[PDB]
Design a binder for this molecule. Structure first.
Ligand SMILES: Brc1ccnc2ncccc12
Ligand SMILES: Brc1ccnc2ncccc12
Length: 119
């Protein structure tokens, strides 16, 4: 019932995500010189370095907030892709599956710990 445990669990999951080749297009903000129309489609850019920095700055209060930003990385890729067969979009789907598989216990344990705190 450790209410703080999610933070290190999220740091470790972000480390695994950075080791993965599929995260390379998402490690830093999308390069606007490479994709000049990006901000015409995407209102809120997000990337894994921004997530890691927000976490390290102590600017996430819960793993739900981190999970919303990570999910925004994937929804931005789905919105920007010209095709469901695109290389970078296909990488985002594999990364999303891996993230969701691993974040589920982090969220469950955190929510359980908060319920125990108010039992
Ligand atoms: Br990194 C990563 C991303 C996507 N799928 C993965 N599957 C297994 C292990 C690491 C993975
Ligand atoms: Br092309 C493409 C497809 C999907 N997501 C993308 N995100 C960033 C840069 C290029 C992308």
């Amino acid at each position: 019932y450790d209410i703080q445990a999610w933070k290190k669990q999220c740091e470790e999951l972000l480390n695994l995500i950075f080791q993965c080749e599929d995260s390379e297009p998402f490690r830093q903000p999308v390069d606007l010189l490479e994709y000049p129309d990006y901000r015409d489609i995407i209102d809120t850019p997000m990337d894994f370095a921004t997530v890691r920095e927000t976490l390290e700055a102590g600017n996430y209060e819960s793993p739900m907030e981190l999970c919303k930003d990570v999910r925004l990385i994937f929804s931005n890729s789905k919105a920007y892709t010209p095709s469901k067969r695109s290389r970078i979009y296909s990488m985002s789907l594999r990364l999303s599956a891996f993230f969701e598989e691993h974040i589920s216990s982090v969220l469950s344990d955190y929510k359980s710990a908060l319920r125990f705190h108010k039992r």
